[PDB]
Write a protein that binds this ligand. Structure first.
Ligand SMILES: CCCCCCCCCCCCCCCCCC(=O)OC[C@H](COP(=O)(O)OCCN)OC(=O)CCCCCCCCCCCCCCCCC
Ligand SMILES: CCCCCCCCCCCCCCCCCC(=O)OC[C@H](COP(=O)(O)OCCN)OC(=O)CCCCCCCCCCCCCCCCC
Ligand SMILES: CCCCCCCCCCCCCCCCCC(=O)OC[C@H](COP(=O)(O)OCCN)OC(=O)CCCCCCCCCCCCCCCCC
Ligand SMILES: CCCCCCCCCCCCCCCCCC(=O)OC[C@H](COP(=O)(O)OCCN)OC(=O)CCCCCCCCCCCCCCCCC
Ligand SMILES: CCCCCCCCCCCCCCCCCC(=O)OC[C@H](COP(=O)(O)OCCN)OC(=O)CCCCCCCCCCCCCCCCC
Ligand SMILES: CCCCCCCCCCCCCCCCCC(=O)OC[C@H](COP(=O)(O)OCCN)OC(=O)CCCCCCCCCCCCCCCCC
Ligand SMILES: CCCCCCCCCCCCCCCCCCCC
Lengths: 606, 504
């Protein structure tokens, strides 16, 4: 339990060694160092969890040093470990270890092997800092390190400028989110005088007994930072474009590390959102709208990685809906299940891409079940877990807990949104599955993570529970009949979505090509393909005036404004030099003019 | 006691580099290295023997060391030096950057290297004298003395690729700006001295005696306006800023001269030391104007740096934006914001030193500085693009480097004082990330759009890599453990803040 700092020391050592290797080591040694650092972090996490469960679920604290000490401003370098932190750390370390083994198989024969492994190790270390920090400033350190590693891993193939533009957009949107998080940090320190989470939940109701406006603003900017990092409304436009990295990069970003940070923000500071119910309802509304828009965008998407990204978007929207209905344990359980099956789906998608030896749209391939049976099985069970297939998959249990918490708290519009989102989720998931794996054919270091995520995306993942008792508040329990009919309705919605997908895309696409060519079909598909015009709006509202102001100011107008007196001095000197014409008669005339001027001035002023 | 030696050792060292050129051309670099090592060792010895961590605030004046010698007794002028935590921090930073500058021009075997080294050491001695003097005439003397070597270095030893007329034009613009601002500061100094003379009857230029000067409202405004014109030209503060990119563009190729005089925050130190304690009420009334000038400077530097096709001008406008951050910090009146300003100044000096050294090494490799002529340089250079990526990460306010601690403590104190300027400056931090990414992706990432960037380039030397990694280590240690730097300057910041907020 005292080795809580080893979970960051080992990935930091791996990142430093792999950065200073500069590719001089062999690929075997670099892969061994990277995946061994992540595996050592996972083993230390396992020992920490064993000691945590053997100690009766007591919260552990390990201070290391004091970060800043300026008067009352005391920020410390302390790590904390409760059930939520243990769940986050175990998810990050295990899924990162599986992704690192897959990448050690996957990045073979590629340049920047050590660079990739160093960036992923720094990503793991920064996410561990994020999930282990006891104060908001240390968690901001992990937050911004996670954003930096996301930037460095998205634009991994730096030769293509489109990857660089994607990394630019990702880092700028996440930096706007981090600025909102900084806004919340400033407000919380100005109000309560501290940045420790327990100190917030201790002396927040005493300070905010009279006024609640500043706490409302703090929770609003916390929500803004959360949706900045979780790729939700209104800061979601970066994800689909920032697909540009390799497959393990997308798996790590979408499943394990990057987009769960906003959920960890909302769940960690749950008391402050509990005393501001309107902000929590706004979190739920934002999640519902995000999952609905993600489903409608994923329905018409033609790229497998892009529809997987919008599936991740809808899953994080479900998670934010669970947070907005005070279903915290359901949200963290959904984090576990969604991380498992989204990692499985992304690894299977990378296997599909490597089998097709090119990144193509889903309509190009078809009937790939005969070529790759194991990858087809992985994609099938990942789609079943994502579509909440009942009784076989853990995604059904996690989503059932989410809507049980939603309906048990009196939220009915969110219930309807969740049911429609589940129907659309099954629809787009098995639409993509049936397009990419059914039709007419045209064209040990990785099997183990695929098998582990194969097991964990089934009910074996639902057998694992997170130790969130005593950390997050308990959900209000639903009636047995209401829970039974909710499970029945969710399962019925799932199977009718499966049957509609089999009607619409497993056979010859007649009704799809019937509803496609119409002008409502063109406008709806154009709107949903371009993420409902959000990226276009942010290009026309934030990018284009920025470029216009840069082009208008590239000549430094203030420099010319302050250089104007130099031009005036030069012109005045040139004008005054005309009196030095060298004529003696003019000199005598000027002397007499000066005599007249001096005498007139003396007569006037006398 | 050691302060006169702390100032005279660079001057005697520069005279030695000029004189010992007869024994060899490779000699004056070693002499300059020895005397900057001695200056840095004296600064570190003052740090160790000062006991700055255990020192508590007692009010202005409170100096850890003090030296007095009469210079012009007719006007009551003394060579009067004094060191405390803030001045010692700036002296240590000056010594470190001087050692880095001496090492950065180690491969110059020019026929007149001795006068170049004298010129550099006289710049460093003038900067140290600015940081040490607590006499108004002596402070102004060093302030305008450190500009003639600056001018001659830019004009004669400047960028050899550019024409001589552009170098002379940029150097003359820089000298005219800095010396006219210094003259206005001298007029403010003289009017303050004469006001104290009419109020008291004693001729003096001492900072301690001029603190308790009874002035009417309006005269104090004019005096602080002159001080602010000087400290805003050399900060730079918009619109009084074009000399900085013009001089950075025409700076010497190695980039040492950038680190020697242009990169050290004498103006913000003067704002903390002279503008706020001498004129507290007038600075309190001028705080909104200075804070909005800092906001406008942050965004003007950001929009300037994004639109720059030159790397050196990009780093210059980065300096403009970060100095706008410091200017916002100084006029808050908060201890936390002042400590953040000190940390930000030190970290920004380190980061800009690393950026300028890497840009100079890149220009040695490729002989160009236009962003339309580089791209995809990551695959051709062994060490340079990753280190430049680290330093550009440092200048965007990334946690793990001291710049983040700087701007975040600045914004914490500012939000404790003024929230709207804080939120707009955080959007300025977003703009900082924007231009850092733009520079990184235009310089080292993509496909090469020139022939000179299509060939393999030689790796960096051992000394350049060693000093850049030393800067990396110092920036990382400042980001993770800024506590010794905070306890070093806790007493001086406390004295200045208490004098500012107890006299309004
Ligand atoms: C954020 C990631 C997780 C954190 C670890 C890595 C952080 C960055 C590593 C580089 C910078 C380290 C700066 C601190 C080094 C230790 C010195 C220190 O802080 O001593 C203070 C404390 C003893 O003094 P105390 O009084 O208790 O402190 C409170 C304030 N008075 O000291 C103690 O109580 C002992 C503390 C021991 C800590 C050992 C950490 C080793 C880390 C090795 C990292 C290797 C890679 C470095 C580069 C990584 C990439 C940037
Ligand atoms: C702390 C936990 C997480 C919390 C959040 C932290 C966020 C901020 C982190 C700041 C640190 C820098 C992060 C980004 C650095 C990226 C450097 C990089 O890309 O290195 C890879 C590169 C080798 O890759 P490759 O491309 O194959 O080689 C070049 C081509 N021949 O490598 C090289 O070329 C050589 C190495 C370049 C520099 C590597 C990083 C240096 C800075 C960290 C270590 C500093 C030294 C350790 C001691 C610190 C003080 C105790
Ligand atoms: C809707 C509610 C919530 C709103 C929150 C606040 C706004 C969030 C905005 C999110 C969207 C940001 C999109 C940024 C895209 C960046 C990537 C991009 O477009 O890159 C293109 C270009 C590349 O740069 P270059 O180096 O020239 O390229 C080499 C050749 N390819 O690079 C560029 O052209 C540079 C683009 C820079 C963009 C800067 C954005 C600054 C945002 C400031 C927000 C201010 C909010 C308040 C405004 C006032 C309100 C009263
Ligand atoms: C906050 C504002 C109020 C307080 C202000 C305090 C004063 C200090 C700050 C402002 C300084 C402004 C200086 C502007 C000129 C800078 C010098 C310069 O640009 O010199 C180069 C230029 C020659 O270069 P080039 O363009 O090649 O000329 C072609 C001719 N062969 O040279 C020339 O063209 C001729 C240069 C002549 C000498 C310089 C100009 C002196 C003008 C008076 C300066 C005093 C301040 C007056 C008010 C300034 C505006 C407010
Ligand atoms: C060749 C052509 C080109 C070159 C030459 C260009 C022009 C050069 C000359 C420019 C300067 C002009 C004169 C500026 C000083 C004016 C002084 C003044 O008006 O004083 C009146 C008053 C005096 O105070 P009083 O009320 O008498 O006090 C006793 C009881 N209270 O004062 C007061 O009460 C206080 C007044 C404060 C505001 C006036 C000063 C404005 C200064 C502007 C520049 C700085 C602006 C701020 C910073 C900008 C960014 C750096
Ligand atoms: C281009 C650059 C150069 C610009 C031009 C040169 C500077 C111009 C300064 C203009 C000052 C205007 C003053 C107007 C009022 C004068 C009458 C007055 O009120 O005198 C009061 C006082 C004498 O009476 P006394 O009994 O001593 O009262 C003590 C009051 N404290 O008076 C005194 O004790 C002396 C008062 C001195 C006031 C300060 C003068 C210098 C201030 C710094 C420079 C100007 C401001 C900054 C730059 C502005 C832009 C250029
Ligand atoms: C002015 C120049 C500043 C350079 C950067 C310095 C940053 C601070 C580094 C301090 C040392 C940190 C690591 C050692 C800590 C030892 C602590 C001993 C007492 C507990």
């Amino acid at each position: 339990m005292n080795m809580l700092a080893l979970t960051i020391i080992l990935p930091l050592i791996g990142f430093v060694l792999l950065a200073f290797s500069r590719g001089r080591w062999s690929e075997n040694v670099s892969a061994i160092v990277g995946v061994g650092s992540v595996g050592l972090a996972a083993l230390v996490t396992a020992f920490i969890g064993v000691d945590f469960f053997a100690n009766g679920e007591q919260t552990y604290s390990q201070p290391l040093w004091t970060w800043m000490s300026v008067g009352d401003f005391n920020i410390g370098f302390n790590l904390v470990l409760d059930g939520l932190s243990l769940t986050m750390l175990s998810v990050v370390t295990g899924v990162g270890f599986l992704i690192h083994m897959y990448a050690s198989w996957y990045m073979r024969g590629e340049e920047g092997y050590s660079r990739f492994f160093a960036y992923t190790n720094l990503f793991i270390a920064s996410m561990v800092v994020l999930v282990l920090a006891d104060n908001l400033l240390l968690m901001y350190l992990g937050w911004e390190g996670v954003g930096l590693c996301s930037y460095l891993l998205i634009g991994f193939y730096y030769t293509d400028p489109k990857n660089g533009a994607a990394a630019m957009k990702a880092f700028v949107v996440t930096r706007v989110g981090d600025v909102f998080l900084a806004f919340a940090l400033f407000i919380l320190y100005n109000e309560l005088g501290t940045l420790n989470f327990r100190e917030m939940v201790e002396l927040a109701p005493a300070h905010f007994a009279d006024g609640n406006n500043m706490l409302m603003w703090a929770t609003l900017m916390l929500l803004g930072g959360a949706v900045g990092k979780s790729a939700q409304l209104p800061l979601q436009t970066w994800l689909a474009d920032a697909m540009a990295g390799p497959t393990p990069v997308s798996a790590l970003i979408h499943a394990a590390t990057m987009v769960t940070a906003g959920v960890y923000l909302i769940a960690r500071t749950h008391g402050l959102f509990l005393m501001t119910p309107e902000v929590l309802h706004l979190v739920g509304i934002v999640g519902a709208v995000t999952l609905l828009l993600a489903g409608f965008a994923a329905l018409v998407q033609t790229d497998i990685k892009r529809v997987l990204a919008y599936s991740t978007m809808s899953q994080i929207g479900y998670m934010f809906l669970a947070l907005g209905v005070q279903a915290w344990d359901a949200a963290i359980f959904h984090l576990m299940t969604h991380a498992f099956f989204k990692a499985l789906l992304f690894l299977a998608s990378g296997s599909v891409i490597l089998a097709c030896h090119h990144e193509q749209n889903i309509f190009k391939m078809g009937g790939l079940r005969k070529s790759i049976p194991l990858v087809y099985l992985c994609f099938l069970v990942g789609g079943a877990a994502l579509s909440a297939l009942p009784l076989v998959t853990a995604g059904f249990f996690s989503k059932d807990e989410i809507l049980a918490g939603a309906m048990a708290n009196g939220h009915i519009n969110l219930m309807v949104a969740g049911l429609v989102g589940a129907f659309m989720t099954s629809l787009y998931t098995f639409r993509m599955i049936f397009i990419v794996f059914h039709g007419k054919e045209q064209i040990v270091t990785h099997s183990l993570p695929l098998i582990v995520l194969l097991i964990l995306s089934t009910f074996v993942g639902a057998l694992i529970v997170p130790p969130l008792q005593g950390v997050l508040p308990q959900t209000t329990e639903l009636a047995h009949g209401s829970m039974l009919t909710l499970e029945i309705t969710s399962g019925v919605v799932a199977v009718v979505g499966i049957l509609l997908a089999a009607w619409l895309w497993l056979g010859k696409r007649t009704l799809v090509t019937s509803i496609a060519n119409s002008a409502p079909g063109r406008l709806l598909s154009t709107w949903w393909y371009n993420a409902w015009g959000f990226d276009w709006l942010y290009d026309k509202v934030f990018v284009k005036p920025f470029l216009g102001i840069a082009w208008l100011l590239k000549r430094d107008p203030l420099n010319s404004m302050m250089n104007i007196p130099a031009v005036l001095s030069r012109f005045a000197g040139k004008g005054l030099l005309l009196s030095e014409n060298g004529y003696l008669r003019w000199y005598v005339a000027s002397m007499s003019i000066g005599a007249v001027v001096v005498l007139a001035l003396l007569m006037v002023l006398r | 006691m050691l302060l006169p030696w702390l100032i005279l050792i660079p001057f005697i060292g520069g005279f030695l580099c000029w004189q010992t050129e007869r024994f060899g051309v490779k000699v004056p670099r070693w002499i300059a290295l020895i005397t900057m090592g001695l200056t840095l060792a004296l600064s570190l010895q003052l740090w160790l023997q000062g006991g700055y961590s255990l020192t508590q605030s007692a009010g202005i004046p409170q100096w850890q060391s003090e030296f007095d010698m009469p210079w012009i007794p007719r006007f009551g002028i003394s060579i009067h030096l004094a060191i405390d935590g803030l001045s010692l921090l700036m002296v240590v930073l000056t010594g470190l950057l001087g050692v880095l500058a001496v090492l950065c021009s180690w491969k110059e075997i020019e026929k007149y290297q001795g006068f170049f080294h004298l010129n550099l050491m006289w710049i460093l001695g003038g900067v140290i004298g600015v940081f040490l003097a607590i006499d108004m005439f002596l402070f102004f003397f060093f302030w305008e003395m450190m500009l003639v070597p600056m001018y001659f270095l830019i004009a004669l030893w400047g960028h050899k690729a550019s024409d001589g007329k552009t170098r002379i034009t940029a150097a003359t613009k820089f000298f005219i700006y800095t010396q006219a601002s210094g003259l206005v500061m001298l007029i403010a100094i003289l009017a303050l001295v004469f006001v104290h003379y009419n109020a008291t009857g004693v001729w003096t230029f001492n900072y301690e005696e001029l603190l308790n000067t009874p002035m009417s409202s309006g005269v104090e405004y004019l005096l602080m306006l002159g001080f602010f014109i000087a400290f805003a030209v050399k900060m730079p503060v918009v619109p009084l800023h074009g000399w900085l990119p013009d001089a950075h563009s025409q700076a010497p190729t190695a980039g040492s001269v950038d680190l020697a005089g242009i990169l050290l925050k004498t103006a913000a130190y003067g704002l903390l030391r002279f503008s706020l304690p001498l004129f507290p009420n007038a600075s309190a009334e001028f705080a909104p104007i200075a804070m909005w000038l800092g906001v406008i400077g942050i965004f003007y530097g950001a929009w300037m740096a994004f639109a720059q096709t030159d790397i050196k001008r990009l780093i210059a406008y980065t300096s403009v934006s970060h100095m706008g951050f410091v200017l916002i910090a100084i006029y808050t009146g908060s201890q936390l914001a002042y400590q953040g300003a000190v940390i930000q100044m030190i970290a920004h000096g380190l980061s800009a030193a690393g950026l300028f050294i890497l840009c100079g090494q890149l220009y040695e490799r490729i002989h160009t500085r236009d962003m339309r002529m580089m791209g995809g340089l990551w695959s051709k250079m062994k060490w340079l693009p990753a280190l430049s990526l680290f330093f550009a990460v440092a200048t965007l306010g990334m946690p793990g480097t001291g710049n983040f601690v700087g701007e975040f403590m600045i914004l914490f104190g500012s939000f404790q004082v003024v929230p709207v300027i804080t939120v707009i400056s955080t959007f300025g931090l977003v703009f900082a990330s924007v231009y850092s990414l733009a520079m990184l992706h235009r310089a080292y990432f993509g496909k090469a759009k020139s022939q000179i960037a299509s060939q393999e380039l030689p790796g960096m030397s051992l000394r350049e890599l060693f000093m850049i990694l030393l800067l990396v280590v110092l920036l990382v240690l400042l980001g993770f453990y800024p506590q010794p730097i905070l306890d070093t300057s806790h007493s001086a910041i406390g004295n200045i803040q208490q004098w500012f907020v107890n006299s309004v």
